[PDB]
């Protein structure tokens, strides 16, 4: 019967999204064959390589890269120049327009270049391009790996910074991973001499085909695992043999929590600890002031459905279980706890009326037995001696599938099975046709 203000926080199932700078050198070699006045294109091959670390620093400092790439293979240095120009030209990063939702790219070269070769001789020309992509990388708890919008997967926690090995996963090679404090990065890659922002810690990883850089942030500062779902000031609290029940008619749902309270000093509630309190205080200063007072301290409960409840009555660790996406079951409790709280109370309003009534009649019989014992004898024999029908039938519910499985498989414009089958068909067309 006691009342309190509750704040329901849902599990942060949305992946933490951050900005990742992908630096990549695109070597696009176009080979053609020239014969008299007609040139025959012999083909093209495009590869992505990781620019050197000093070039990454130069890009982050000046928004400019170099038109030359060097790679060490078997002790031999192979150098590729842009447009077969053997100079050391420094090229600026200019935008390539496009939309790509949230995949803005800055490229030094915006047009493919290729010149025809000499007569009776094939010529191959390089089209090295310095591309920096500000991609959106999403990670999910326990954040052992994060992947960008493109096809890049890394086995490194976004918060690992060398000294956080025991608390943050790190499965990639330590040789390819670097940490730089007080690192300077350009604010805008599109123009040179842009403002250089300083960051406390930046992590770099030399991938096979590119270099992935990200600004290191504290896990408990920007990657909190609880998201505010809804606050309810008018909530009825009840106790049952194994559960605390919090029923809110604003959302028409009741949540059941175990017979224990989560410690307020838990490490998973940090960014919420103040926030969940603050809103509560705001509520205490918005709807139930003056005439009401805070009964007890703020408590934390974990419901059986996975939701988190911050409770403050007004007059011991969290688990890894996630919240249920569909909350109708909670509404089901609201369909029960109400009726269970109604029908029983109705009985408490009928039997209490009945027991008195049977008493009131009984005294009428008590004297009547002295005058007319026939009524008492009939009552104790329940036989002579000498309301409404029930439309509550069996309403067996059927499976109301609004959309069939065929309709469910065609909700989105992309189907993974069809794409994989098309890729297999492409492989067959390029290999099996031979």
């Amino acid at each position, epitope marked *: 019967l006691d009342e309190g203000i509750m704040v329901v926080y849902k599990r942060n199932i949305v992946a933490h999204t951050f900005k990742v700078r992908v630096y990549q050198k695109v070597l696009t070699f176009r080979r053609s064959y020239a014969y008299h006045r007609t040139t025959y294109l012999l083909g093209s091959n495009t590869e992505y390589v990781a620019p050197p670390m000093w070039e990454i620093h130069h890009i982050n400092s*000046h928004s400019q890269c170099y038109s030359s790439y060097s790679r060490v293979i078997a002790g031999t240095v192979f150098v590729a120049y842009h447009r077969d120009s053997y100079e050391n030209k420094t090229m600026q990063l200019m935008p390539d327009d496009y939309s790509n939702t949230h995949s803005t790219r800055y490229v030094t070269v915006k047009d493919q270049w290729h010149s025809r070769g000499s007569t009776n001789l094939t010529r191959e020309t390089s089209n090295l391009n310095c591309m920096v992509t500000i991609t959106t990388a999403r990670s999910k708890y326990p954040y052992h790996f994060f992947a960008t919008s493109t096809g890049d997967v890394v086995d490194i926690s976004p918060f690992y910074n060398g000294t956080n090995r025991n608390a943050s996963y790190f499965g990639e090679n330590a040789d390819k991973f670097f940490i730089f404090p*007080n690192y300077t990065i350009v604010s805008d890659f599109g123009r*040179p001499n842009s403002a250089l922002e300083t960051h406390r810690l930046v992590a770099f990883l030399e991938r096979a085909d590119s270099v992935i850089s990200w600004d290191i942030q504290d896990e408990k500062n920007v990657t909190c695992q609880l998201t505010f779902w809804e606050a309810s000031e008018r909530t009825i609290r009840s106790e049952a043999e194994d559960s605390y029940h919090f029923s809110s008619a604003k959302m028409t749902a009741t949540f059941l929590s175990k017979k224990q309270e989560v410690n307020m000093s838990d490490s998973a509630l940090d960014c919420v600890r103040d926030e969940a309190i603050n809103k509560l205080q705001q509520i205490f200063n918005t709807s139930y002031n003056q005439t009401y007072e805070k009964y007890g301290n703020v408590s934390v409960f974990e419901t059986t459905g996975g939701l988190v409840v911050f409770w403050q009555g007004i007059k011991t660790h969290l688990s890894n279980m996630e919240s249920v996406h569909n909350l109708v079951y909670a509404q089901l409790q609201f369909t029960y706890d109400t009726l269970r709280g109604y029908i029983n109370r109705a009985l408490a309003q009928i039997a209490e009326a009945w027991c008195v009534d049977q008493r009131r009649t009984l005294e009428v019989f008590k004297e009547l037995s002295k005058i007319n014992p026939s009524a008492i004898l009939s009552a104790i024999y329940n036989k002579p001696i000498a309301l409404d029908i029930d439309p509550l039938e069996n309403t067996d519910f059927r499976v109301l599938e609004l959309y069939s499985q065929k309709e469910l498989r065609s909700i989105n414009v992309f189907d993974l099975e069809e794409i994989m089958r098309e890729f297999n068909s492409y492989k067959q067309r390029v290999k099996y046709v031979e």
Partner: antibody
Amino acid sequence: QVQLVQSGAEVKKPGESLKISCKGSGYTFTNYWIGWVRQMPGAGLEWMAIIFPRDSYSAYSPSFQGRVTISVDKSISTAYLHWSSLEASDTAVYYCAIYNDLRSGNSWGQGTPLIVSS
Amino acid sequence: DIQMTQSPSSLSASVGDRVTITCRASQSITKYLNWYQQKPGRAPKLLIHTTSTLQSGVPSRFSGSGSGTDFTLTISSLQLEDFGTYYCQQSFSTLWTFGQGTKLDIK
């Protein structure tokens, strides 16, 4: 955006060495390049030293070879200008600036006038 | 080496007159082409940057534009404190080229 305060006016005769201190005020930075210039009456500013924030190399190809030495440091970035063999042509106002703080903002220092007089 | 010409060399105007000053150079690309402001006995201070953004603290009475190798700075209304020496310059990486600077004064 960064004030880049500089030491007050200094008076020194030619021949000996000149020391100038230029504090990196405004905000603790290790990103904005440092430029030391001099200005004389009748003309504008002329570049004399362009160096990185966290260190210095005293890049001077066409002007005053060996006459300028800059050290600076990290974090607070306290720039130190040192001049050897001071000449009469060096009587001018020296300025320290950051190359770009925000939106191509080259904020100059207060300016130290090296002037020889009585 | 590159050339730089800021025009006019010297000019005069009354209070509250729109004035345009031009800057020309042989730069390969646009670079930045910022515009400054200086007074006799005072350190130089910026006015405009990138031909699209202005220094904080300077009101919107100044504007900038450019085309080809020419860049113009326009003032809607001249004030008493607006008279002084103005400069245009280019700056890329660490290389920096400065301008002679126009002089604005009132008789």
